[PDB]
Amino acid sequence: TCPFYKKIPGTGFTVDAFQYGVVEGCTAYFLTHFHSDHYAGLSKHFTFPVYCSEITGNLLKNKLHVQEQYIHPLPLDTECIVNGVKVVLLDANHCPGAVMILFYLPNGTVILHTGDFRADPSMERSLLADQKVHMLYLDTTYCSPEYTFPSQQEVIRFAINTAFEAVTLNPHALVVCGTYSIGKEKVFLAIADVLGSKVGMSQEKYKTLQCLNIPEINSLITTDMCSSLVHLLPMMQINFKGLQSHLKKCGGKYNQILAFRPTGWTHSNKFTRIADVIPQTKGNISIYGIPYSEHSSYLEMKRFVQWLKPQKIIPTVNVGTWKSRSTMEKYFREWKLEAGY
Numbered sequence: 001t002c003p004f005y006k007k008i009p010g011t012g013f014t015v016d017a018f019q020y021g022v023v024e025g026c027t028a029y030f031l032t033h034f035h036s037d038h039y040a041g042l043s044k045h046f047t048f049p050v051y052c053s054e055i056t057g058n059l060l061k062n063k064l065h066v067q068e069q070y071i072h073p074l075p076l077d078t079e080c081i082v083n084g085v086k087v088v089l090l091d092a093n094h095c096p097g098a099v100m101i102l103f104y105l106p107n108g109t110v111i112l113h114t115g116d117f118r119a120d121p122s123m124e125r126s127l128l129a130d131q132k133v134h135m136l137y138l139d140t141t142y143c144s145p146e147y148t149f150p151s152q153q154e155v156i157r158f159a160i161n162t163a164f165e166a167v168t169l170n171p172h173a174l175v176v177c178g179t180y181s182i183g184k185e186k187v188f189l190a191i192a193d194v195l196g197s198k199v200g201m202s203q204e205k206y207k208t209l210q211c212l213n214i215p216e217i218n219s220l221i222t223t224d225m226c227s228s229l230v231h232l233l234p235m236m237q238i239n240f241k242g243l244q245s246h247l248k249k250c251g252g253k254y255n256q257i258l259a260f261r262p263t264g265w266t267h268s269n270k271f272t273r274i275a276d277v278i279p280q281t282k283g284n285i286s287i288y289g290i291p292y293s294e295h296s297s298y299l300e301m302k303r304f305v306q307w308l309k310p311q312k313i314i315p316t317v318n319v320g321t322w323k324s325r326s327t328m329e330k331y332f333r334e335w336k337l338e339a340g341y
């Protein structure tokens with residue numbers, strides 16, 4: 001059964017609630033983004049209205065075969081009426097097509113559901129600036145002060161400089177980047193751009209990328225692995241055994257692998273700066289774990305909430321243990337006392 005924190009009071013709406021069968025009283029199902037923990041349950045046999053971004057709707061149609069007549073794509077930054085309720089979709093700074101949803105309830109209450117997001121000051125100048133929000137349904141993935149990580153720009157600088165150095169020293173080195181879902185495309189696209197290569201990948205992953213409206217993409221990606229020196233592999237194959245096996249398949253074109261695993265946070269964040277990151281190495285194979293996050297750090301989250309000043313916060317992540325819930329509630333109270341709302 002659907003949990004309370006996926007239901008929008010005063011409406012017929014749910015958010016990211018496709019794995020519960022027919023939800024009692026639900027007239028429209030919203031989907032914030034195309035990640036499996038959120039879309040779990042959708043298929044060609046779904047016959048209720050799904051409301052989402054254009055990019056998310058491309059992925060539903062092409063990857064899950066949802067029928068077109070039930071996909072309702074909405075433009076961003078635009079007031080729309082859904083089953084008699086005004087809604088706005090805003091960029092979530094997560095993966096491609098990911099949104100936050102503003103609901104303007106018939107009684108005057110305004111609710112923001114962040115979906116999954118990486119808070120940024122640029123959000124303080126969207127349509128959020130223009131009215132008060134009463135309730136916030138918050139992505140609390142990294143809601144603890146130990147969670148610090150660098151900007152995306154510093155992480156990409158590190159990756160480009162690392163790859164360009166390695167391949168310029170050894171033109172027979174292959175670069176490999178791990179993936180298991182959409183998101184974090186800048187990692188492999190920025191590396192291919194500095195090297196003058198396309199990114200090579202499976203037909204299934206090329207298909208997924210072609211649903212994303214990324215400009216000039218036919219220019220950056222390919223299924224011809226032989227023409228590419230940046231390859232994308234499943235995240236599970238980014239280990240010494242999996243990479244040795246891949247290098248065998250390349251027929252003596254290459255004699256070294258430099259591989260990247262974009263994780264979110266790992267505890268080596270509490271001690272080491274991005275500048276100081278080193279790989280794990282075995283023979284002619286090196287593997288870099290890089291802290292490329294598409295969720296808010298603790299400080300970015302705190303700043304957003306202290307700017308927004310909601311009356312009530314409903315966490316959507318880490319809600320299954322009493323220790324996590326108590327921790328989060330304690331930080332929400334601190335933020336409110338420090339800022340004065």
Ligand code: NI
Pocket residue numbers: 033035094116
């Ligand atoms: Ni996500």
